[PDB]
Design a protein around this ligand. Structure first.
Ligand SMILES: CC(C)C[C@H](N[C@H](CCNC(=O)OCc1ccccc1)C(=O)O)C(=O)N[C@@H](Cc1ccccc1)C(=O)NCCN1CCOCC1
Ligand SMILES: [Ca+2]
Ligand SMILES: [Zn+2]
Ligand SMILES: [Zn+2]
Length: 168
């Protein structure tokens, strides 16, 4: 079961920029994990996201460590892995990834795509789920696959509406 709060982007076409990259995995793997995480939400709602190299983007992603000037510092390896801000200007919608963690793209601890998809749901306005199988559950889990559970479909669609088009 979810628990939704309030703020939500009053525009269906957002833009995002990936400020920097983890030296842990190739640039293309980072770009693609982020892209694929956005693609999940886009599959069930009328939202659209566009990667931007520069200019004003709505969602700014960055890998940071410890105190990164936003009043909520990271803790090093383990524990807090990342965090995103709910819809709004400035840091609203932004997502920071704890650089102290090793970011992977497989079963090895801390699959970037699995954490990014979770965080980005926050940037859209999603609260957490109680359902241990949903994507918005409060702690990291990797079934080997990352697809929205009913809880996630329901929570996000309640805010933005459902898609018209099928999926794949
Ligand atoms: C679900 C995850 C993919 C993401 C999750 N990230 C955040 C955690 C809260 N971080 C955070 O910084 O919260 C306050 C905040 C929120 C927004 C902006 C600024 C500040 C979230 O999704 O709400 C996380 O780091 N969770 C940690 C656990 C944790 C939770 C909150 C705070 C600190 C640690 C985790 O799963 N880490 C995996 C290891 N463990 C640790 C022990 O329990 C079993 C899981
Ligand atoms: Ca950490
Ligand atoms: Zn931060
Ligand atoms: Zn969360």
């Amino acid at each position: 079961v979810l628990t939704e709060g309030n703020p939500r982007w009053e525009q269906t076409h957002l833009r995002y920029r990936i400020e920097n990259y983890t030296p842990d995995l190739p640039r293309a793997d980072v770009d693609h994990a982020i892209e694929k995480a956005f693609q999940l939400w886009s599959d069930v709602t009328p939202l659209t996201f566009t990667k931007v190299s520069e200019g004003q983007a709505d969602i700014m992603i960055s890998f940071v460590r410890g105190d990164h000037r936003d009043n909520s510092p990271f803790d090093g390896p383990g524990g807090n892995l990342a965090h995103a801000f709910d819809p709004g200007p400035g840091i609203g919608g932004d997502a920071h990834f704890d650089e102290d963690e090793r970011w992977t793209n497989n079963f090895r601890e801390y699959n970037l795509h699995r954490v990014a998809a979770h965080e980005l749901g926050h940037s859209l306005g999603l609260s957490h789920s109680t359902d241990i199988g949903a994507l918005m559950y409060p702690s990291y889990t990797f079934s080997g696959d990352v697809q929205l559970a009913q809880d996630d479909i329901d929570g996000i669609q309640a805010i933005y509406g459902r898609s018209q088009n099928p999926v794949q």
